[PDB]
Amino acid sequence: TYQEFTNIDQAKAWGNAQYKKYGLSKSEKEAIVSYTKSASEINGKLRQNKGVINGFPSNLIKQVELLDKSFNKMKTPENIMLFRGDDPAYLGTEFQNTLLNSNGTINKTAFEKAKAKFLNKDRLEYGYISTSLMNVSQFAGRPIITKFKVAKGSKAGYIDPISAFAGALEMLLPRHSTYHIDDMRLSSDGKQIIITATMMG
């Protein structure tokens, strides 16, 4: 079973308890802060280079390597569910402008195609993955919610306290992670795709 927080006070308490135990260095803390300030831009370069950072500038390599190594200290003590919201382009360029009907519902034919493309497949993310312990307004309007099943002992860091650029209840996952898409469904009001995926390392 995977713990899914349904109360924000419990979630915050649990995350803070993990954060206080990490024993991060000054330089690791600084690398995480720098990452939150440049997250979208850094993840793009990781994607273009397919995770190869050798060609990056010296200072950027050091930041990325510190961040990578900081995950040695940031592991979840239990099976946990993490949440992420995404826009249509997450499913591919072919879905960017076709996933939705004008009335705000997911187009059911596009959904069928998305399910055929991704269901029971593994996906590799070159960037780091930002998630949250709960879906509590920070993914408002996003048509795709992913629920990641993250096993006890997995690399995952509660960084909500570290920086003003960290998201609410943010759990950051390491770069170059692979997850398996277990299930894809529509929400009861037809306005979201809900994806369940099992995180690998």
PDB file of C-alpha atoms in Angstrom, residues 87-169:
ATOM      1  CA  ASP A  87      -0.558  20.238 -19.707  1.00  0.00           C
ATOM      2  CA  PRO A  88      -1.465  18.391 -22.947  1.00  0.00           C
ATOM      3  CA  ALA A  89       2.044  18.636 -24.490  1.00  0.00           C
ATOM      4  CA  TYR A  90       3.253  16.204 -21.780  1.00  0.00           C
ATOM      5  CA  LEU A  91       1.658  13.436 -23.886  1.00  0.00           C
ATOM      6  CA  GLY A  92       3.483  14.542 -27.054  1.00  0.00           C
ATOM      7  CA  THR A  93       3.412  17.360 -29.610  1.00  0.00           C
ATOM      8  CA  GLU A  94       0.513  15.589 -31.349  1.00  0.00           C
ATOM      9  CA  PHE A  95      -1.623  16.010 -28.184  1.00  0.00           C
ATOM     10  CA  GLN A  96      -0.756  19.641 -27.406  1.00  0.00           C
ATOM     11  CA  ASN A  97      -3.631  21.112 -29.423  1.00  0.00           C
ATOM     12  CA  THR A  98      -5.918  18.054 -29.676  1.00  0.00           C
ATOM     13  CA  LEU A  99      -6.406  16.656 -26.156  1.00  0.00           C
ATOM     14  CA  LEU A 100      -9.279  18.961 -25.177  1.00  0.00           C
ATOM     15  CA  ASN A 101     -12.739  19.886 -26.371  1.00  0.00           C
ATOM     16  CA  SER A 102     -13.711  23.569 -26.208  1.00  0.00           C
ATOM     17  CA  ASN A 103     -16.130  22.823 -23.335  1.00  0.00           C
ATOM     18  CA  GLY A 104     -13.158  21.896 -21.114  1.00  0.00           C
ATOM     19  CA  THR A 105     -13.626  18.120 -21.219  1.00  0.00           C
ATOM     20  CA  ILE A 106     -10.929  15.733 -22.364  1.00  0.00           C
ATOM     21  CA  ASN A 107     -11.698  14.611 -25.902  1.00  0.00           C
ATOM     22  CA  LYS A 108     -12.515  10.937 -25.474  1.00  0.00           C
ATOM     23  CA  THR A 109     -10.933   9.890 -28.786  1.00  0.00           C
ATOM     24  CA  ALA A 110      -7.708  11.731 -27.875  1.00  0.00           C
ATOM     25  CA  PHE A 111      -7.854   9.944 -24.522  1.00  0.00           C
ATOM     26  CA  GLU A 112      -8.154   6.580 -26.283  1.00  0.00           C
ATOM     27  CA  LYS A 113      -5.056   7.438 -28.349  1.00  0.00           C
ATOM     28  CA  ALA A 114      -3.102   8.629 -25.283  1.00  0.00           C
ATOM     29  CA  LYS A 115      -3.957   5.373 -23.512  1.00  0.00           C
ATOM     30  CA  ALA A 116      -2.827   3.319 -26.524  1.00  0.00           C
ATOM     31  CA  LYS A 117       0.442   5.294 -26.643  1.00  0.00           C
ATOM     32  CA  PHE A 118       1.356   5.100 -22.955  1.00  0.00           C
ATOM     33  CA  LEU A 119      -0.578   2.399 -21.069  1.00  0.00           C
ATOM     34  CA  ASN A 120       1.742  -0.363 -19.798  1.00  0.00           C
ATOM     35  CA  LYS A 121       4.809   1.484 -21.159  1.00  0.00           C
ATOM     36  CA  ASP A 122       7.918   2.742 -19.392  1.00  0.00           C
ATOM     37  CA  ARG A 123       8.802   6.424 -19.670  1.00  0.00           C
ATOM     38  CA  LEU A 124      12.210   8.010 -19.029  1.00  0.00           C
ATOM     39  CA  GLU A 125      12.424  11.612 -17.812  1.00  0.00           C
ATOM     40  CA  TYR A 126      15.759  13.367 -18.361  1.00  0.00           C
ATOM     41  CA  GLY A 127      14.859  16.285 -16.098  1.00  0.00           C
ATOM     42  CA  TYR A 128      14.216  16.122 -12.373  1.00  0.00           C
ATOM     43  CA  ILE A 129      10.560  15.498 -11.465  1.00  0.00           C
ATOM     44  CA  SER A 130       8.814  17.941  -9.156  1.00  0.00           C
ATOM     45  CA  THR A 131       5.776  16.484  -7.400  1.00  0.00           C
ATOM     46  CA  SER A 132       3.629  17.328  -4.403  1.00  0.00           C
ATOM     47  CA  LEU A 133       2.433  15.287  -1.420  1.00  0.00           C
ATOM     48  CA  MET A 134      -1.105  16.476  -2.292  1.00  0.00           C
ATOM     49  CA  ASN A 135      -3.146  18.051  -5.089  1.00  0.00           C
ATOM     50  CA  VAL A 136      -4.183  21.246  -3.253  1.00  0.00           C
ATOM     51  CA  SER A 137      -4.732  24.021  -5.874  1.00  0.00           C
ATOM     52  CA  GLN A 138      -1.197  24.299  -7.319  1.00  0.00           C
ATOM     53  CA  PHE A 139      -2.297  22.171 -10.310  1.00  0.00           C
ATOM     54  CA  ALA A 140      -5.563  24.058 -10.867  1.00  0.00           C
ATOM     55  CA  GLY A 141      -6.680  23.923 -14.495  1.00  0.00           C
ATOM     56  CA  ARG A 142      -4.159  21.244 -15.510  1.00  0.00           C
ATOM     57  CA  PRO A 143      -5.905  18.522 -17.566  1.00  0.00           C
ATOM     58  CA  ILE A 144      -3.530  15.663 -16.587  1.00  0.00           C
ATOM     59  CA  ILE A 145      -2.835  14.486 -13.043  1.00  0.00           C
ATOM     60  CA  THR A 146      -0.196  11.816 -12.473  1.00  0.00           C
ATOM     61  CA  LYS A 147      -0.153   9.798  -9.266  1.00  0.00           C
ATOM     62  CA  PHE A 148       3.304   8.290  -8.722  1.00  0.00           C
ATOM     63  CA  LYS A 149       3.721   5.232  -6.489  1.00  0.00           C
ATOM     64  CA  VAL A 150       7.112   5.684  -4.833  1.00  0.00           C
ATOM     65  CA  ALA A 151       8.420   2.740  -2.809  1.00  0.00           C
ATOM     66  CA  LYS A 152       9.922   2.878   0.655  1.00  0.00           C
ATOM     67  CA  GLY A 153      13.646   3.603   0.387  1.00  0.00           C
ATOM     68  CA  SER A 154      13.344   5.503  -2.912  1.00  0.00           C
ATOM     69  CA  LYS A 155      15.162   8.772  -3.573  1.00  0.00           C
ATOM     70  CA  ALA A 156      12.697  11.619  -2.951  1.00  0.00           C
ATOM     71  CA  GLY A 157      13.281  14.920  -1.153  1.00  0.00           C
ATOM     72  CA  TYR A 158      10.888  17.219   0.689  1.00  0.00           C
ATOM     73  CA  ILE A 159      12.256  20.628  -0.334  1.00  0.00           C
ATOM     74  CA  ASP A 160       9.252  22.854   0.433  1.00  0.00           C
ATOM     75  CA  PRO A 161      11.260  24.412   3.363  1.00  0.00           C
ATOM     76  CA  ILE A 162      14.547  24.985   1.443  1.00  0.00           C
ATOM     77  CA  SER A 163      13.672  27.845  -0.905  1.00  0.00           C
ATOM     78  CA  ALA A 164      11.040  30.469  -1.799  1.00  0.00           C
ATOM     79  CA  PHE A 165      10.916  28.928  -5.294  1.00  0.00           C
ATOM     80  CA  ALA A 166       9.967  25.438  -4.055  1.00  0.00           C
ATOM     81  CA  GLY A 167       6.335  24.468  -4.538  1.00  0.00           C
ATOM     82  CA  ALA A 168       3.896  23.734  -1.731  1.00  0.00           C
ATOM     83  CA  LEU A 169       4.602  20.319  -0.211  1.00  0.00           C
TER      84      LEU A 169
END
